[PDB]
Amino acid sequence: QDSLPDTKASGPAHSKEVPALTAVETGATNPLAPSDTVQTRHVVQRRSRSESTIESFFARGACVAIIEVDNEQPTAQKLFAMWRITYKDTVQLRRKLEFFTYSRFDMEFTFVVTANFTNANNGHALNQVYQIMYIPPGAPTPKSWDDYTWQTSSNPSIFYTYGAAPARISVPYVGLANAYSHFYDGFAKVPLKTDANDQIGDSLYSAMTVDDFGVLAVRVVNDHNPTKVTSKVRIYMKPKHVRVWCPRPPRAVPYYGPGVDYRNNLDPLSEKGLTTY
Amino acid sequence: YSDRVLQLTLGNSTITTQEAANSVVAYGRWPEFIRDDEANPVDQPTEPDVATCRFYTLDTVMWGKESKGWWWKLPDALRDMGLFGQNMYYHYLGRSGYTVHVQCNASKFHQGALGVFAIPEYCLAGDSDKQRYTSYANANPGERGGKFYSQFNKDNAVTSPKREFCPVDYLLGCGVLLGNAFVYPHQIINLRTNNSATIVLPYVNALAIDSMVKHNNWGIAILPLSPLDFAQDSSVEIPITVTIAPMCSEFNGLRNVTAPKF
């Protein structure tokens, strides 16, 4: 029942009504079937637009972060790491979302952890447990790999044991607005004439908030091996139950920062002659 | 009757055009006040009707042979236009739709084409290597608006940066190819076809109501898709006039007046 409209049979025409002529100045686009300019047979059209739906378009999970943590005894060492949860630092999922101005989705986050020994002589280590702790905005961040914040009394946390299936969770629509804003024509602060200095009202263009959706903190829970084990927690982000709300042209030139700014490679189109097929 | 001839009237103001090319209601939605099941603030909204919802005419810009384009932001272009600008500055939250009318008149012997585009959340690219560093006074130019450029000249004044935009014209000022801007609500003023364009804009935002001083809901971009030619003259200039009326203006959170630094 998802099928496209059938092409109707169309004979020759000699008519005062003319489908081919139009005026794109109106902003409308001419809604022609091929039956309205060429002769067509009837064909029962069994194709459908199922893979082009918005949930089908966004159904594939995409990498958004590669978080690196060390495990080594102190003698320079990253025993824990922290990442501000954003889509905008990997270009592919960012360009797919930035087809639209606003969107509204639940998320799946899938965590793939890969570890390796860092020097060949130092040998073996036992299996590692990884704590991935969500720190919402305003909650206390750790200042060491084993302070009180890792006790995770009110924070969500994933304890992943190494070699298991890649740990995953779902997160609801968490936005303060009714949809997430991919683009924001505005500021967080307005400078006023009564301000004591300009930096009271100065804020970044197109930034809504700093620490917008919080921080993921990652550590090895184990006490440190004498051998150095380096590990990477890759984070894969899948939007689901997606509704999108205002279409945009996709990004043509390369991305530069979390804004719409551009700096290099402002030549997205190649050379091809006007008469060359 | 014909859709070349339109009369638009809002408040005490009236536009008549005899060379229109229909009109665009953006995304099929005519502007409306906030319904009670979509409302966020509890404060009783000021809805001034005919005092704010009337056709205000911005400064006329001259289209010439080397013009690369012009842009404005809403509600920022109307921030000094009468009781709308006063209600916008006196209230924390504001919603309005807009009717954008662009007038551009030329003879049957002139040629040229303007694409008028209405962009929701029209972010523009900055002038420099520092990310997102465009100041408020330069991001909000008022009824003067801003201009597009043919190339990305980059600010190297380390002593004191300009903190402006650099909108490149074929990049639509934001890094997207201009031929795809027709997914936005749009009309073309093609001088053999029409002298005017009408886009009716609803309140497109992720919230029911928002800070009008902080945030621009729409950006209007006017770019010459085909350049202006007349006779065999190098000195051709024809006027473009942009007239915007708010529609369904409502405001919440009355306080002392916002006085932004410019």
Partner: antibody
């Protein structure tokens, strides 16, 4: 320890610095150059990343300064290709090797300068 | 374009002093890469706080650090005569350059 070259004293002409380190720290970490005119305070000049030979220079020096690398000796170099009297400064070589907990962009590790070399003065006058 | 610092700060031993460092919204107000460096005379600088409120190993707990907006602050609590010297603030800045403060000489009275 990170070892600097000796002191130079010439006006008007180009001056080349040398900075040698251990083989592991050269291949893993970035090398930053910082200068200090007498009493005037620290001033970041740029960065060489010998793992990939990418360079960044500060805008005060983007024409004037080139940085190059030697994998055989684990040495980095800096050449100040034109010189002025205000370049009379103590020039520091520093390895960025203290890692920040905050993930740089979303794919990389940020490093602060912790292994500073002893550095060298250059005086630029007749 | 350098980060603003007071040129000198003074206090007697046993007191708490606070050196402060104000930059723009594209360095301290956006990044948490805000560090502090201590320079006794003739020595190469020593990193004393790397991330905000984070000390390296072997740096005493009288040093402490915080961020309040576009401003970062270094508090030395229980000041001693060995703390006399220069203190340099540092941050990353969004065009991928790095910037030092102008430096504060601390005189222990």
């Amino acid at each position: 320890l990170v070892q600097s070259g000796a002191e130079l004293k010439k006006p008007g002409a180009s001056v080349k610095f040398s900075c040698q380190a251990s083989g592991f720290t050269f291949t893993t970490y970035d090398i930053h150059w910082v200068r200090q005119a007498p009493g005037q305070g620290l001033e970041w000049m740029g960065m060489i990343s010998p793992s990939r030979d990418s360079t960044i220079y500060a805008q005060k020096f983007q024409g004037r300064v080139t940085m190059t690398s030697d994998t055989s000796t684990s040495t980095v170099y800096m050449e100040l290709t034109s010189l002025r009297s205000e370049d009379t400064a103590l020039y520091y070589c520093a390895t960025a090797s203290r890692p920040s907990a905050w993930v740089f962009r979303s794919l990389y590790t940020y490093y602060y300068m912790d292994v500073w070399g002893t550095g060298t003065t250059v005086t630029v006058s007749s | 374009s350098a980060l603003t610092q007071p040129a000198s700060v003074s206090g007697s031993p046993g007191q708490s002093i606070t050196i402060s460092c104000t930059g723009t919204i594209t360095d301290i107000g956006y990044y948490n890469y805000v560090s502090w460096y201590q320079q006794h005379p003739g020595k190469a600088p020593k990193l004393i706080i790397f991330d905000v409120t984070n000390r390296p190993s072997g740096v005493s707990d009288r040093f402490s650090g915080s961020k309040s907006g576009n401003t970062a602050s270094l508090t030395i609590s229980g000041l001693q005569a060995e703390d006399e010297g220069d203190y340099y603030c540092f941050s990353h800045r969004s065009n991928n350059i790095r910037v030092f403060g102008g430096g504060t000489k601390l005189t222990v009275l």
